[PDB]
Amino acid sequence: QVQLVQSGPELKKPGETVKISCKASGYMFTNYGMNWVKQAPGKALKWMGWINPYTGESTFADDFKGRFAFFLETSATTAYLQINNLKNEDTATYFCARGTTIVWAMDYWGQGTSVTVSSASTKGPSVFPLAPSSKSTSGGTAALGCLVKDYFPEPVTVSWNSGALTSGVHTFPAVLQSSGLYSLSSVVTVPSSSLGTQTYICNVNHKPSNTKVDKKVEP
Amino acid sequence: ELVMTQTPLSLPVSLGDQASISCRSSQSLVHSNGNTYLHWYLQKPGQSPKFLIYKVSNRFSGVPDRFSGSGSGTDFILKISRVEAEDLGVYFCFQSTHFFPTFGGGTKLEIKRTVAAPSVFIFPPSDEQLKSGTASVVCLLNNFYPREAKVQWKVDNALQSGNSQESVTEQDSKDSTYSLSSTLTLSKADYEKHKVYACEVTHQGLSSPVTKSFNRGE
Ligand SMILES: C[C@]12CCC(=O)C[C@H]1CC[C@@H]1[C@@H]2CC[C@]2(C)C(=O)CC[C@@H]12
Numbered sequence: 001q002v003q004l005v006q007s008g009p010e011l012k013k014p015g016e017t018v019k020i021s022c023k024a025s026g027y028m029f030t031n032y033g034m035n036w037v038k039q040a041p042g043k044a045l046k047w048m049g050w051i052n053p054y055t056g057e058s059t060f061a062d063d064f065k066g067r068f069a070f071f072l073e074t075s076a077t078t079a080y081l082q083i084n085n086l087k088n089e090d091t092a093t094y095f096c097a098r099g100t101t102i103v104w105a106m107d108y109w110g111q112g113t114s115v116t117v118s119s120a121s122t123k124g125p126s127v128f129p130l131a132p133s134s135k136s137t138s139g140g141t142a143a144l145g146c147l148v149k150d151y152f153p154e155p156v157t158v159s160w161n162s163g164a165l166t167s168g169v170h171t172f173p174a175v176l177q178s179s180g181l182y183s184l185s186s187v188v189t190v191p192s193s194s195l196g197t198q199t200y201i202c203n204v205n206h207k208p209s210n211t212k213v214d215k216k217v218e219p
Numbered sequence: 220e221l222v223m224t225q226t227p228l229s230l231p232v233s234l235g236d237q238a239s240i241s242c243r244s245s246q247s248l249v250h251s252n253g254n255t256y257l258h259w260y261l262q263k264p265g266q267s268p269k270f271l272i273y274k275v276s277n278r279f280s281g282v283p284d285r286f287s288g289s290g291s292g293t294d295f296i297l298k299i300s301r302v303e304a305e306d307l308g309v310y311f312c313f314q315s316t317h318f319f320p321t322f323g324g325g326t327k328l329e330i331k332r333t334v335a336a337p338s339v340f341i342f343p344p345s346d347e348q349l350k351s352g353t354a355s356v357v358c359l360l361n362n363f364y365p366r367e368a369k370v371q372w373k374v375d376n377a378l379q380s381g382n383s384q385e386s387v388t389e390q391d392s393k394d395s396t397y398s399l400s401s402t403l404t405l406s407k408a409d410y411e412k413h414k415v416y417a418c419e420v421t422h423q424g425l426s427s428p429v430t431k432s433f434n435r436g437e
Contacts, residue, residue, distance in 0.1 A: 045260075062220075103256075103258075109269075110267065128348045141338075143340040145342070173386050183402070187400070
């Protein structure tokens with residue numbers, strides 16, 4: 001199938017340069033355009049421009065003439081977006097999207113790359129267990145989780161049991177404290193009978209700080 | 220610089236009802252070549268956008284028949300008939316007739332459903348956290364509708380002001396409910412000055428408020 005896999009989240013000081021990559025597979029790379037789209041936090045989608053892999057030429061929307069560039073590495077079927085002289089307005093999620101030129105539309109999109117522009121250094125989270133509400137030998141369902149506390153910037157990724165536990169998970173939006181750092185919780189509900197036998201681990205990954213943590217949560 | 224106006228900004232719709240999203244262009248989207256390059260995307264919470272409709276009225280692959288587009292010239296509609304929980308998200312029209320391509324501002328489709336009461340849970344600080352010098356207490360309201368909910372913290376039966384933070388998920392894409400965390404953050408010293416910790420929840424689903432509590436070191 002068609003897949004567009006983008007590189008990971010970035011933190012950069014104002015004035016620096018960032019290069020974002022989008023690896024394509026599952027189709028003839030040069031025969032479709034590559035579009036870049038910006039989405040600032042809470043805001044709508046903005047078409048930045050596209051590069052034509054067949055001729056190597058770029059075209060930009062008016063707001064993106066100047067500090068922006070698209071590159072290609074055709075043998076590695078990868079497209080890049082470079083932004084130089086970074087500003088605060090550039091903090092956003094950036095999507096590559098394949099252009100199916102037969103109808104002038106973007107058809108498949110990448111998962112997005114978050115870029116934060118900031119003067120502050122990264123700060124990795126501390127992870128604390130939120131211990132099961134009930135004992136194994138009582139009825140109904142129990143809730144358990146992980147507090148992912150005091151990190152910068154967003155995003156953090158939380159999974160349970162390395163993706164094997166998916167049902168009943170709620171990972172909350174990060175919130176800022178007066179300290180200027182984010183915290184969030186991820187929680188899951190499980191049959192309380194399974195607490196006796198099943199083990200629950202939350203895997204936290206904060207890539208900008210190279211923090212990976214696996215916390216066992218039990219009674 | 221054509222503007223793409225998309226109305227409404229948010230559209231509440233019940234399950235099984237029809238939803239209508241309007242998108243308006245300041246100039247005709249008919250290309251001198253005869254085609255109309257108006258498209259629709261949906262972005263579900265957390266996800267990248269997904270291609271839905273191309274050239275006004277054609278469904279992209281795998282898109283259910285309950286989605287249809289219509290309109291001509293400057294006025295376009297997207298209709299979602301018999302709405303499903305999975306349909307939740309922000310819908311964007313997108314034009315590529317005129318240079319440069321533009322999106323509309325998006326319309327957030329939200330599901331109306333019956334009131335559902337929260338399940339409430341409280342979590343004491345972990346010891347790992349305490350021995351790092353702080354204490355967060357976490358109250359969880361799980362799977363409720365509507366979004367409006369009141370959470371009050373009482374510490375030895377005194378009401379707390381402005382030392383907690385709320386966070387709410389997006390509507391669940393299966394049952395259209397929300398969940399919410401309330402977090403009370405105290406310094407370890409302050410935390411150990413008190414014995415009983417409680418959140419009280421008020422909500423349309425509960426006939427009267429529900430309190431969950433623990434006694435420090437229980
Ligand atoms: C440049 C252009 C080239 C062909 C044309 O005359 C229209 C423009 C504007 C729309 C563009 C298109 C090529 C492919 C693009 C970039 C897409 O894949 C989405 C919008 C499309």
